[PDB]
Structure 1
Amino acid sequence: GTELDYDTFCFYYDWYGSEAIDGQYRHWAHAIAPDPNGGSGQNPGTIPGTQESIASNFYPQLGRYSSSDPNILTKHMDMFVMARTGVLALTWWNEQDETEAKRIGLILDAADKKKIKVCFHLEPYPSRNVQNLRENIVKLITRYGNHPAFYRKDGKPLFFIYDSYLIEPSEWEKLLSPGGSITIRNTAYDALMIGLWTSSPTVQRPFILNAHFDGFYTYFAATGFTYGSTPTNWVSMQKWAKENGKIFIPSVGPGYIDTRIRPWNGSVIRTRTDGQYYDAMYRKAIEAGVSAISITSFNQWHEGSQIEPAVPYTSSEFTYLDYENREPDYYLTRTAYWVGKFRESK
Structure 2
Amino acid sequence: LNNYLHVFYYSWYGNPQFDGKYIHWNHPVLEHWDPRIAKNYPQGRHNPPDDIGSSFYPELGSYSSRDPSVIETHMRQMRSASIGVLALSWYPPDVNDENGEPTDNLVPTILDKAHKYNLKVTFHIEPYSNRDDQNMYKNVKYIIDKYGNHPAFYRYKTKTGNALPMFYVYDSYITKPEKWANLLTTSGSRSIRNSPYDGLFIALLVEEKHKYDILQSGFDGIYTYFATNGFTYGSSHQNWASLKLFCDKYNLIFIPSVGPGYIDTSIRPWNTQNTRNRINGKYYEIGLSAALQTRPSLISITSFNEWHEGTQIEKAVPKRTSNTVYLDYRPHKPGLYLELTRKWSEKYSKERATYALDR
**Structure 1 segment 50-199 matched on structure 2, within 5 A:** 50-96=48-94, 100-154=103-157, 155-199=163-207
Q: Matched residues in 2 for 1:326 and 1:38: separation?
A: 40
Q: Which residue in 1 is equivalent to 2:281? A: 275
Contact 2:202–2:221 (CA<8 Å) still a contact in 1?
yes
Partner residue in 2 for 1:224: 230
Indicate whether 1:215 and 2:226 are aligned.
no
Contact 2:2/2:345 (8 A) holds in 1: yes
Give the match's secondary structure for 2:245.
helix
Q: Distance in 1 between matches of 2:4 and 2:202?
A: 13
Distance 1:291 1:40 in 2: 43
In structure 1, C-alpha distance between the alignment counterparts of 2:176 and 2:262, rounded to whole Å:
30
Q: For residue 164 of structure 2, give the secondary structure of its aligned residue in structure 1.
A: coil
Of residues 86-95 and 187-196 in structure 1, the stretch that sits farther from structure 2 once superposed is 86-95
Shift of 1:326: 1.3
Confirm or deny: 8 A CA contact 1:271 1:277 kept in the other structure: yes
Tell me how far 1:19 sits from its aligned partner.
1.9
Partner amino acid for 1:110? K
Alpha-carbon offset, residue 304 of structure 1: 0.2
Q: Does 1:6 align with 2:3?
A: yes
Deviates more, 1:178-187 or 1:101-110: 101-110
Moved more, 129-138 or 90-99: 90-99
Structure 2 unpaired stretches of 5+: 96-100, 158-162, 353-359
Q: Report how far residue 36 of structure 1 moved.
A: 2.4
Letter in structure 2 aligned against 1:291: S
Q: Which residue, 325, 344, 349 being the options, matches 1:338? A: 344
Question: 1:160-209, CA deviations, whole angstroms, 9 ceiling, x for partnerless residues?
Answer: 00001101111110000011100010001001000001112xx1221111
CA RMSD of aligned residues (A): 1.5
How far off is 1:101 after superposition? 3.5
SS at match of 1:229: coil
Tell me how far 1:317 sits from its aligned partner: 3.6
Pair 1:41–1:51, CA change in 2 (3 A): closer
SS in 2 for 1:256: coil
SS in 2 for 1:90: strand
The number of residues matched between the two structures is 341
Structure 1, residues 216-254: CA drift from partner, whole Å, max 9, x if none?
A: 000000111100000011111111111110000000000
- Aligned residues of 1:120 and 1:160 also touching (Cα < 8 A): yes
Q: Check conservation: 1:53, 1:317, Cα contact below 8 A.
A: no
> What is the letter of the counterpart of residue 23 of structure 1?
G
CA displacement at 1:48 relative to structure 2: 3.0
**2: CA distance between counterparts of 1:234 and 1:48?**
37
The alpha-carbon deviation at position 54 of structure 1 amounts to: 0.4
Match of 1:19 among 16, 21, 27: 16
TM-score (norm 2): 0.92
SS of the equivalent of 1:30 reads: coil
Q: Secondary structure at the match of 2:106?
A: helix
For the residues of structure 2 that align with 1:222 and 1:95, how far apart are their CA atoms?
A: 31
Once the two structures are overlaid, the 10-residue window that deviates more, 94-103 or 172-181, is 94-103
Q: Percent identity?
A: 45
CA drift at 1:50: 1.8
TM-score, normalised with respect to structure 1: 0.96
Residues 70 and 99 of structure 1, relative CA distance in 2, 3 Å threshold: farther
1:47–1:53 Cα contact (<8 Å) kept = no
Give unpaired runs (5+ residues) of structure 1.
none
What secondary structure does 2:4 align onto? strand
1:325 equivalent to 2:331? Answer yes
Q: Does 1:29 align with 2:35?
A: no
**Preserved contact between residue 93 and residue 105 of structure 2 (Cα < 8 Å):** no
Structure-1 residue corresponding to 2:316: 310
Secondary structure of the residue aligned to 1:33 is coil
Q: Contact 1:27/1:49 (CA < 8 Å) preserved in 2?
A: no
Deviations 1:19-42 (A, max 9, x none): 221121210001101112452884
Decide whether the 8 Å contact of 2:32 with 2:38 is kept in 1. Answer: no
Q: Summarize deviations over 1:292-326 as a string: whole Å, max 9, x none.
A: 00000000000000000000000124210000111
Pick closer, same or farther for the CA change 1:301–1:41 going to 2, 3 Å: closer
Q: Do the aligned residues in 2 keep the contact of 1:22 with 1:66 (CA within 8 Å)?
A: yes
Residues 92, 104 of structure 2: 8 Å contact kept: no
CA distance 1:31–1:250, shift in 2 (3 Å): same
